[PDB]
């Protein structure tokens, strides 16, 4: 029952599924962190997704790493609805 983000439904318009955007795995070992990036663009009734992942090893929660990296597109979305606000989500099961 983790789908606590939404409780009510309505008519749906687009139901694409694919491989998860976060393919980085922590099962190898620790001591390095992920650097997920995402750029969202909504123009002429379209939507684009760009993402890259690189290791950092050192955490240093102060600033982004000093390095250049290209960001290739992942998927293109043909939904042409108005967008004005951004909201993110978290994963929290219980106190532990």
């Amino acid at each position: 029952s983790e789908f606590r983000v939404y409780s009510s439904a309505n008519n749906c318009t687009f139901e694409y599924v694919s491989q998860p955007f976060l393919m980085d795995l922590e099962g190898k070992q620790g001591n390095f962190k992920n650097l997920r990036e995402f750029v969202f663009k909504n123009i002429d009734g379209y939507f684009k997704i760009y993402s890259k992942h690189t290791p950092i090893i050192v955490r240093e929660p102060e600033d982004l790493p000093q390095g250049f990296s290209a960001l290739e597109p992942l998927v293109d979305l043909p939904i042409g609805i108005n967008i004005t606000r951004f909201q993110t989500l978290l994963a929290l099961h219980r106190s532990y």
């Binding site: 318009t13 687009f14 009734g45 043909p78 939904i79 042409g80 609805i81």
Partner: protein, 49 residues
């Protein structure tokens, strides 16, 4: 079954086309031909003419 052809039931399916501007997500096919090389040809690759 004994009723006349005019009185017989006909299953009717009606298709409505709404040319909405934004999505344009679904429509019909587009046939592709064979490939030739080393010849001066007019190519149309995914809309690139």
């Amino acid at each position: 079954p004994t009723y006349g052809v005019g009185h017989q039931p006909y299953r009717v399916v009606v298709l409505s086309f709404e040319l909405l501007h934004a999505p344009a997500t679904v429509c019909g096919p587009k046939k592709s031909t064979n490939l030739v090389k080393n010849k001066c040809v007019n190519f149309n690759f995914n809309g690139l003419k």
